[PDB]
Amino acid sequence: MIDVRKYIDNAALKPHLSEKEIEEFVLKSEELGIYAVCVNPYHVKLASSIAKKVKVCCVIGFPLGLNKTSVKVKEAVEAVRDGAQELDIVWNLSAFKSEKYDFVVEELKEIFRETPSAVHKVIVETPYLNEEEIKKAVEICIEAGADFIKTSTGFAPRGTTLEEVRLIKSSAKGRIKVKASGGIRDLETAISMIEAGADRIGTSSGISIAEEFLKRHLILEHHHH
Amino acid sequence: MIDVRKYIDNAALKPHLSEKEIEEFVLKSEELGIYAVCVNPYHVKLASSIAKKVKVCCVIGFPLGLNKTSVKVKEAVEAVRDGAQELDIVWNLSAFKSEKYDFVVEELKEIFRETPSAVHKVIVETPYLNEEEIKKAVEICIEAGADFIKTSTGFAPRGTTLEEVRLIKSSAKGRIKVKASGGIRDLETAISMIEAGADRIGTSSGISIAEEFLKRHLILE
């Protein structure tokens, strides 16, 4: 009976989307009581102008995370100046893979300190990580002082798994929140991810999921009868 | 075959690639005589530090093109300083779709002017455009003064087709060059794309293609 809407970060990140489409996307989400909307930097100002109660989240160095630190910082800074309340920042996976852990932590710390007012979520790209790397990823995000660790950008051949979220939840030990995203297109999946540890859910199907929840809540029993 | 290596922009853009792999990629491409390597901003310094004859290309605002103009500018400038000789810039498709053509042209013009020493290629993302939008795309790239109009980006449900290349070439009518990319995995395809009008080939399988070219040459003669 989980109110999934409050966990949803509805994403409208497709490049072919018009500004009008972004506007109505933000409106529908607000109407459905969805917690937040995730958009690309170009759409931050627009989203914040339309949004009333819905939080405005902006993707930084998305989706590849291979922009220079200075560029990620500028993008993070400008995102907040355009009205961003939350930042889903893609870390530098190549540096991580090259074992430049300090560089990864410092890039995140620098981006965070230049944007103290926003909630910081670090996308670590779990579909490219094995168990050990995920444990390291968690320690990196915690050392960086992130509020959340986001599993995936969606730009991968595999969606996030329940195993991945369960592991992150266990490794975290309550010192960081978890955002499950990537391949989540329905209510049952969103619910399972939350039950597995997710504190927030990333999806581009937030409207459909929110409606399916509404339908079930209106029709099926579960209250006090 | 008409030496396809001179047309190849070998791309190494997956984020899971370590810096050791990027180095090996650039080295291998160099040994095979590939025209250029295409990398993300972070890898430009590394790529240029090992590249001898291969040209260094950097993707800007890649692959979504929805970054602010200001950041795309900074990214482009930083790329040049790191050693980039060519820049493959993703235009703002949202703005395009919203009919903000002037915005789109102006963003590109601005990026180009801050990096006058680099070859400028505009990725228009053809898999998200119909025939009419492709023709408008061509007129935008020409108006912006780009050297090449690039088809895909690689992150799309479909690659480029011979029909798209033929279309772009005829619409261009010698006013801009064409770089075909997206789904080009082998020599046969690379050759057909060039025959269709491609002046450059964007591919992540450049090593395989160049090797196939050498093998055919050495085995046939």
UniProtKB/Swiss-Prot annotation, chain B:
Keyword list, A-Z: Cytoplasm, Lyase, Schiff base
Known pathway: Carbohydrate degradation; 2-deoxy-D-ribose 1-phosphate degradation; D-glyceraldehyde 3-phosphate and acetaldehyde from 2-deoxy-alpha-D-ribose 1-phosphate: step 2/2
Annotated InterPro entries: Aldolase_TIM, DeoC, DeoC/FbaB/LacD_aldolase, DeoC_typeI
EC number: 4.1.2.4
Catalytic activity: 2-deoxy-D-ribose 5-phosphate = D-glyceraldehyde 3-phosphate + acetaldehyde
Residues annotated as the enzyme's active site: 88, 150, 179
UniProt-listed Gene3D superfamilies: Aldolase class I (3.20.20.70)
Intracellular or extracellular location(s): Cytoplasm
Biological-process GO terms, alphabetical: 2-deoxyribose 1-phosphate catabolic process; carbohydrate catabolic process; deoxyribonucleotide catabolic process
Taxonomy, superkingdom: Bacteria
A GO cellular component annotation in the UniProt record: cytoplasm
Principal location listed in the UniProt entry: cytoplasm
Disulfide bonds: none
Key word Cytoplasm present: yes
GO molecular function, one term: deoxyribose-phosphate aldolase activity
PANTHER family per the UniProt record, alphabetical: DEOXYRIBOSE-PHOSPHATE ALDOLASE (PTHR10889:SF1)
Family to which the UniProt record says this protein belongs: Belongs to the DeoC/FbaB aldolase family. DeoC type 1 subfamily.
Described function: Catalyzes a reversible aldol reaction between acetaldehyde and D-glyceraldehyde 3-phosphate to generate 2-deoxy-D-ribose 5-phosphate.
Protein name per Swiss-Prot or TrEMBL: Deoxyribose-phosphate aldolase
Originating organism: Aquifex aeolicus (strain VF5)
Annotated gene: deoC
